[PDB]
Amino acid sequence: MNPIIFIIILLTIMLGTIIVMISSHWLLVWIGFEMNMLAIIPIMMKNHNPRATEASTKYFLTQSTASMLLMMAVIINLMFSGQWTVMKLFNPMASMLMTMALAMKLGMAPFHFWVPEVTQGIPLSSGLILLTWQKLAPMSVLYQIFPSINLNLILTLSVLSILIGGWGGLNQTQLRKIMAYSSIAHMGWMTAVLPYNPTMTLLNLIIYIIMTSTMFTMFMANSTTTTLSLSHTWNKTPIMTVLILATLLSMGGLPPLSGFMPKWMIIQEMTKNNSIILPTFMAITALLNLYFYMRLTYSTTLTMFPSTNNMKMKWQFPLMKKMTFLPTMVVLSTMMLPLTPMLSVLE
């Protein structure tokens, strides 16, 4: 891939997301989704190996099916309303189809099976796009149709995502599958608060993106994709292990780290609506996420695993990866709890 071609394709991925976000017409929203899927597959196939081919095919089949259900909902909405405006849907069957269509696009459980596999099959840079940028467009549509979403359906997906994400991460030794299951679990929190306060869905989304972007950027820096490969970081870049520790604890929602904020704010919103059993269940089940974050901090930062002799050759060479924005993202990933009231800007 010619560098100019990569930029144009990369700009098209953003263009499709932006089209969804600025569109007031259901057709243009669907077009934006198609444009996004068209441009992301070549990024997935960038390295041209059988695994990347499998991931791209599994991704394409899933996203195509969601687009069909989404467009079906739009046409049903047109029959029962005669209009195309992006807003609440006027038919409950259309609401179900759109909600499920967006659930597949996000990778929410039980439409989650593709997220672990696609993420594992593609490079880290592509996985970063998949688990962060690709969340924006479906969430922005959910942010506009939520008044007509069936409450039981959306909360059922949120609960299942948190459980399935929590349990799925416990068995993983690959860093890309850990980030996939962690992503599934975090998506559950975003949609659980969606019916009550959409602002806290945006807050959780932004903070999830900052923390996920930081973790992928640190994995890219040392070119690590397994738990054991990451366990050598202490012997080359000690500073990196400390940043991984702080970021991982934040992702686990431990105060006083930034990652505690979205969980804190979502519990507040749910209790204000006399929803007590669900936030309690959610917070406890999120302890599964913390458990398999803590294993990574054990093998990465708090202990020292054995090295290999050839590691000494890497002591003589500096990191040359861009690590774009890493110093800023890690500070935002960890030291933002004192600034929590700034969430009103999202209002």
Binding site: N47, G121, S231, T303, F305, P306
Partner: protein, 70 residues
């Protein structure tokens, strides 16, 4: 007694395909280091054709056996 640190036996707990072995995952190997699986040994088969003898371009008595790809 100096501080304990993980040895090889401890580290290999985290080097398998999964953290918790089960009978359904006994056949799983860790993925390739560089994400590249070996190409298949399978040989793609070329179409074999009789070109003649009974053929306008075979002069009536040439049995040209061709192996074609497309």
């Amino acid at each position: 007694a100096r501080q304990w640190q993980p040895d090889v036996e401890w580290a290999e707990q985290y080097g398998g395909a999964v953290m918790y072995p089960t009978k359904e995952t006994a056949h799983w190997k860790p993925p390739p280091w560089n994400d590249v699986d070996p190409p298949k040994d399978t040989l793609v088969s070329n179409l074999t054709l009789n070109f003649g003898p009974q053929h306008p371009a075979a002069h009536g008595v040439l049995r040209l056996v061709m192996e074609l790809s497309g």
